[PDB]
Amino acid sequence: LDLAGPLLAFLFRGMFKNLLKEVRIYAQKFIDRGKDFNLELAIKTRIIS
Amino acid sequence: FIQMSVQRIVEDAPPIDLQPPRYLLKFEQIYLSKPTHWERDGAPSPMMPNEARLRNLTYSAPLYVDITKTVIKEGEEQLQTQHQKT
């Protein structure tokens, strides 16, 4: 029986992987210049929420 | 789930690898607080379930994670900058 904990863990793994994927994409696009990198604008809280 | 599984999911995720200089991202620990409003002026306030029911709010709590960012500039010094409560 899959209760709230396994159901939310399954639901959350993919969302966290999507957050990592978007951080990778944005960071790569911004670091192709090689200038700098900042985390706080590279993380989209809306994904998980 | 909240106590074990979120930490396990965050930790078991592979470290982000990126690149010239090379950058690595690691997630150290997660922290959860009591449910709180983000009121429209930004002011914190504990949100009661009755108020969440009445105002059509969502009874949720913010999630913070410590992130360590290591930058390698090939100069033998890899600078790590840790960020608390991201």
Short mmCIF file of C-alpha atoms in Angstrom, two decimals:
data_model
loop_
_atom_site.label_atom_id
_atom_site.label_comp_id
_atom_site.label_asym_id
_atom_site.label_seq_id
_atom_site.Cartn_x
_atom_site.Cartn_y
_atom_site.Cartn_z
CA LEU A 1 0.00 0.00 0.00
CA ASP A 2 1.39 3.36 -1.11
CA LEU A 3 0.56 5.94 1.55
CA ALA A 4 1.22 9.69 1.63
CA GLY A 5 4.99 9.32 2.25
CA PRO A 6 5.78 7.00 -0.70
CA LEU A 7 3.27 8.88 -2.92
CA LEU A 8 4.89 12.26 -2.16
CA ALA A 9 8.42 10.83 -2.42
CA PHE A 10 7.65 9.55 -5.92
CA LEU A 11 6.01 12.88 -6.79
CA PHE A 12 9.00 14.83 -5.39
CA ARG A 13 11.90 12.93 -6.97
CA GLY A 14 10.91 13.99 -10.48
CA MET A 15 10.29 17.60 -9.47
CA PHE A 16 13.69 17.84 -7.78
CA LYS A 17 15.31 16.35 -10.88
CA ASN A 18 13.49 18.97 -12.98
CA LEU A 19 14.81 21.69 -10.67
CA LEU A 20 18.33 20.35 -11.15
CA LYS A 21 17.83 20.15 -14.92
CA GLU A 22 16.67 23.77 -15.14
CA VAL A 23 19.54 24.92 -12.91
CA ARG A 24 21.91 23.10 -15.28
CA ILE A 25 20.35 24.64 -18.39
CA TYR A 26 20.26 28.21 -17.06
CA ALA A 27 23.74 27.97 -15.53
CA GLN A 28 25.26 26.55 -18.75
CA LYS A 29 23.55 29.28 -20.86
CA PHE A 30 24.84 31.97 -18.45
CA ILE A 31 28.40 30.48 -18.08
CA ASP A 32 29.01 30.10 -21.85
CA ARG A 33 30.35 33.65 -21.51
CA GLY A 34 32.40 32.59 -18.47
CA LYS A 35 31.65 35.87 -16.58
CA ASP A 36 30.29 34.63 -13.18
CA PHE A 37 27.36 32.59 -11.70
CA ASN A 38 24.79 33.23 -8.96
CA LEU A 39 22.46 30.64 -7.44
CA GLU A 40 19.48 32.62 -6.12
CA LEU A 41 18.20 33.69 -9.58
CA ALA A 42 19.07 30.27 -11.10
CA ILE A 43 16.60 28.39 -8.86
CA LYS A 44 12.88 28.39 -9.72
CA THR A 45 10.85 27.78 -6.56
CA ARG A 46 7.67 27.63 -8.70
CA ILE A 47 8.66 24.20 -10.06
CA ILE A 48 8.36 22.35 -6.76
CA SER A 49 5.66 24.57 -5.27
CA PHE B 1 8.51 11.15 4.40
CA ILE B 2 9.27 14.66 5.67
CA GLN B 3 11.96 13.45 8.10
CA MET B 4 13.84 10.76 6.11
CA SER B 5 12.77 10.65 2.47
CA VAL B 6 13.22 14.32 1.51
CA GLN B 7 16.78 14.26 2.88
CA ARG B 8 17.49 10.97 1.10
CA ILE B 9 16.15 12.28 -2.22
CA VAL B 10 18.16 15.51 -1.93
CA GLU B 11 21.38 13.72 -0.91
CA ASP B 12 21.16 10.86 -3.43
CA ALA B 13 20.85 13.29 -6.34
CA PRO B 14 24.08 13.34 -8.37
CA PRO B 15 26.28 16.42 -7.91
CA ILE B 16 25.78 18.97 -10.70
CA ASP B 17 28.84 19.05 -13.04
CA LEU B 18 29.40 22.15 -15.27
CA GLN B 19 32.08 24.02 -17.37
CA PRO B 20 37.74 26.86 -19.23
CA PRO B 21 36.88 26.82 -15.46
CA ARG B 22 34.67 24.02 -13.97
CA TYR B 23 31.81 24.41 -11.45
CA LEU B 24 30.25 21.80 -9.10
CA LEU B 25 27.12 22.09 -6.95
CA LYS B 26 26.38 19.99 -3.87
CA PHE B 27 23.41 19.99 -1.49
CA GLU B 28 24.31 19.54 2.17
CA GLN B 29 21.15 19.50 4.32
CA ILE B 30 17.49 20.50 4.20
CA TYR B 31 15.55 22.48 6.80
CA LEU B 32 11.79 22.86 7.24
CA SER B 33 10.07 25.50 9.36
CA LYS B 34 6.56 25.79 10.74
CA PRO B 35 3.91 26.85 8.19
CA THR B 36 4.06 30.65 7.65
CA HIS B 37 2.44 33.28 5.36
CA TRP B 38 4.33 35.22 2.76
CA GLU B 39 1.96 38.21 3.20
CA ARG B 40 1.87 40.75 0.30
CA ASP B 41 4.22 43.22 2.11
CA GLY B 42 6.64 40.27 2.81
CA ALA B 43 5.94 40.25 6.59
CA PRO B 44 6.07 36.82 8.29
CA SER B 45 3.08 35.55 10.26
CA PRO B 46 2.13 32.04 11.43
CA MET B 47 -0.81 30.79 9.37
CA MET B 48 -3.58 28.90 11.21
CA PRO B 49 -5.53 26.14 9.35
CA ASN B 50 -8.79 28.01 9.98
CA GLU B 51 -7.38 31.09 8.24
CA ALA B 52 -6.05 28.94 5.40
CA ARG B 53 -9.57 27.43 4.96
CA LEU B 54 -11.20 30.89 5.10
CA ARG B 55 -8.84 32.79 2.76
CA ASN B 56 -8.37 29.94 0.23
CA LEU B 57 -4.68 29.79 1.10
CA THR B 58 -2.44 26.72 0.85
CA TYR B 59 -1.21 25.34 4.17
CA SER B 60 2.46 24.80 3.35
CA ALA B 61 5.91 25.40 4.80
CA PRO B 62 9.05 26.77 3.12
CA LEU B 63 11.91 24.38 2.37
CA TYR B 64 15.51 25.47 2.67
CA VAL B 65 18.64 23.59 1.60
CA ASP B 66 22.32 24.39 2.14
CA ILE B 67 24.20 24.52 -1.18
CA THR B 68 27.98 24.37 -1.51
CA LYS B 69 29.31 25.78 -4.79
CA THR B 70 32.92 24.90 -5.69
CA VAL B 71 34.58 26.78 -8.57
CA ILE B 72 37.79 25.47 -10.15
CA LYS B 73 39.88 28.12 -11.92
CA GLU B 74 42.90 25.83 -12.63
CA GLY B 75 44.96 27.96 -10.22
CA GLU B 76 45.22 25.10 -7.67
CA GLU B 77 42.69 26.94 -5.44
CA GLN B 78 39.09 25.75 -5.80
CA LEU B 79 36.92 28.29 -3.99
CA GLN B 80 33.85 26.90 -2.22
CA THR B 81 31.01 29.28 -1.27
CA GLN B 82 28.37 27.78 1.02
CA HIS B 83 24.88 29.31 1.07
CA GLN B 84 22.67 28.82 4.12
CA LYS B 85 18.87 28.56 3.95
CA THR B 86 18.39 28.56 0.13
#
